[PDB]
């Protein structure tokens, strides 16, 4: 029942690999649906062609700013911002897919893939998914990161959509 979405990652335009995610629509349906629809481009806007603006090795890979490409933008399928649905799920370790935000109830399109346990983010960021396949590709993307988050090479979602 839980949807599966895919991202085809590219490094400086060169294909790297595919990361697939299980979206926890059972536990966080509204947040899951946002990511799913943004990955399909159903609503006319979404992640295709977007980049990962901030990659910090040993922490996380952040993306989803399809409007300004630098962390200052992004929009939800429900308007500019939506509420924190719930905090049932926690940042248990690598692979966790959670929503970025600028404070309470400020979810848009920006998300992050955890490359380590981020328990300080529990209760502040909504966890809605996890990497099902291609954690190896996330690890490969992480090596283009830096301590300040700046990427050594452009990491982009060349293609994205829904599997099955």
């Amino acid at each position: 029942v839980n949807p599966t979405v895919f991202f085809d990652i590219a490094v400086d335009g060169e294909p790297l690999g595919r990361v697939s995610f299980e979206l926890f629509a059972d536990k966080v349906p509204k947040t899951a649906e946002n990511f799913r629809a943004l990955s399909t481009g159903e609503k006319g806007f979404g992640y295709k062609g977007s980049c990962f603006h901030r990659i910090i090795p040993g922490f996380m890979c952040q993306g989803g700013d399809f409007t300004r490409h630098n962390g200052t933008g992004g929009k939800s399928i429900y308007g500019e911002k939506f509420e924190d649905e719930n905090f049932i799920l926690k940042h248990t370790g690598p692979g966790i897919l959670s929503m970025a935000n600028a404070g309470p109830n400020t979810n848009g399109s920006q998300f992050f893939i955890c490359t380590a346990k981020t328990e300080w983010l529990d209760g502040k960021h909504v966890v809605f998914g996890k990497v099902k396949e291609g954690m190896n590709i996330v690890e490969a993307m992480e090596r283009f990161g830096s301590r300040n988050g700046k990427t050594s090479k452009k990491i982009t979602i060349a293609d994205c959509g829904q599997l099955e």
Binding site: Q62, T72, A100, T118
Partner: peptide
Amino acid sequence: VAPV
């Protein structure tokens, strides 16, 4: 860091 995880903000916007």
